[PDB]
């Protein structure tokens, strides 16, 4: 779900929400995808 742009807030903290708003939820920034796409893009070119 991190590769598909879903941040689970129960996974990076304790929760004391469910609705899709950055005042109380958190925005996910896809920075892991580019490093994985090198390597599945290099296996295509071997």
């Amino acid at each position: 779900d991190l590769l598909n742009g879903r941040l689970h807030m129960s996974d990076l903290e304790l929760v004391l929400i469910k609705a899709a708003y950055i005042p109380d939820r958190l925005q996910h920034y896809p920075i892991m995808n580019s490093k994985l796409n090198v390597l599945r893009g290099e296996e295509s070119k071997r």
């Binding site: 590769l3 994985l36 390597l39 599945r40 296996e43 295509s44």
Partner: protein
């Protein structure tokens, strides 16, 4: 022409003719690419042949 062949060469032509067609038919390289993404995510790269 088949007198100069040996049994381990007759078996290798039967095996390669199966694989050369079915890699080219199913596009088996792209089956191996989508499993490599599950390798770098789960650590588990699992394939079923039936």
């Amino acid at each position: 022409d088949y007198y100069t062949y040996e049994w381990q060469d007759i078996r290798e032509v039967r095996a390669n003719e199966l694989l050369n067609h079915y890699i080219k038919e199913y596009d088996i390289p792209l089956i191996f690419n989508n499993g490599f993404m599950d390798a770098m995510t789960c650590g588990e790269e699992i394939y079923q042949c039936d």
